[PDB]
Amino acid sequence: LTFLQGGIVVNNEGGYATSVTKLKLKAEGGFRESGNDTNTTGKITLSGESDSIPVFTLEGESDWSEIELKQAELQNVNLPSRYFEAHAELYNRKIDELGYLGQTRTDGTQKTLGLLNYGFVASGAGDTAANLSGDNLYQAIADLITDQWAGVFNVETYKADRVVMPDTVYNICAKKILNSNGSEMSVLRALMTNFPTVTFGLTTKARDVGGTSRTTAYSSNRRAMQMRIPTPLNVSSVDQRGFKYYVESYFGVAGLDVIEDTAGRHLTGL
Amino acid sequence: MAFNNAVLQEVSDLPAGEVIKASPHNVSAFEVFQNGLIEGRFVKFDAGSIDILDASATPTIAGIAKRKVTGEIGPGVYSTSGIEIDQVAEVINFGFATVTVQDAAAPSKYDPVYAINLDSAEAGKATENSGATGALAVADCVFWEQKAANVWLVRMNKFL
Amino acid sequence: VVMPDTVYNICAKKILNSNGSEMSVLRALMTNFPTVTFGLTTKARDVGGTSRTT
């Protein structure tokens, strides 16, 4: 579960609103050369923009009979405690899945994009990382990182400071030797040396995104992308009806609030 | 303009698309649905999506579009991609639920419900008269009692 | 030295020669020019219609 360790800040802001809207204020204008006693023509004003993200809500359910609870106490399995922990664990896993790939519908189509499958600019690498040379693997990952940096005009706030790649590709990089002619040092050990600010992460979620693996660089800054979980996991008090105990647990979670469009970049195919 | 109907003669009863929870009842969430899905109407299930009744061969009536109390103020409408975005289509498929009826219809208790199957505004409206245009026999559902003006609480014997 | 941020980034990521080490073009410059501090700017991206280092 690497998303919450992926640097993205989580914002529980709009409690039960069905949408979260953010506002941006941009200053426009500039100074003009003026004389000693002249009336300027340099006016500084500002405009703004708005960006909205819908909020959806997930709700799970568990239940147990008293016969169930007492019988399982033979095994030392505490069905209330185990069900609550299953609710919490599934909620954490769901948050990870939502942050990385968003939400997919039960029928199969997908409604909200996450970090991996967002509409960033996506370039396809030469070939698969396994088929790819150590120098060319370094070149692909570094070309991704610096292409994102050029896209953001190298602003420290929006500059990609993290990269997540499938565990297959991350292991390949960590173990692919850059060039045998220099030393045994790996591609990942070269990237971690020439990019001392980018922390390379991994996730199984990236193994197949839209029919092909997907590496992505992004900036883990509040003002670049946030993880909107307006309603953390709320577990209802146990409803006992006769001897049947029943628990619901809902959390209202927006997707990944990608505040700025070109705040991430994709390598499709590696 | 101003508030409609300053003073009403009687307190209006249950609005259409409402489910009584004293009786056994089931409202089931469908995530994909059609934009402009009118609440308080029979809704069909087509191509794996809850959408409005329209002239078809034999639509799969999936129930009654539940009216959201904490929804957007406005016409009873399920919306996608707005400030009033509705994430799922809440559909009442079991129990007693209120559905609009054709203004011509004059039903009564234990009468077999007929939904309207037309590409018009009357889509999904209930009726007793089976000779009404586009009268589709909803399986195992009966009018129970007149709640509001042109709204009847019907009973779905089994799930829809 | 000031170079456009694209050129500075390419300097700081392009390894000098993989056969020698992972040391990048920028690292080689910083080692061979112990007195030169290599900066970057964005306004150097298109001065005069063509990227310019100074």
Partner: peptide, 24 residues
Amino acid sequence: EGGIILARNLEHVSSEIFTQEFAG
């Protein structure tokens, strides 16, 4: 009919304001 919550209240305009950023 419809609902009870006015549409603009179903949206939480974030208190955090994001200033526009320019090159360094």
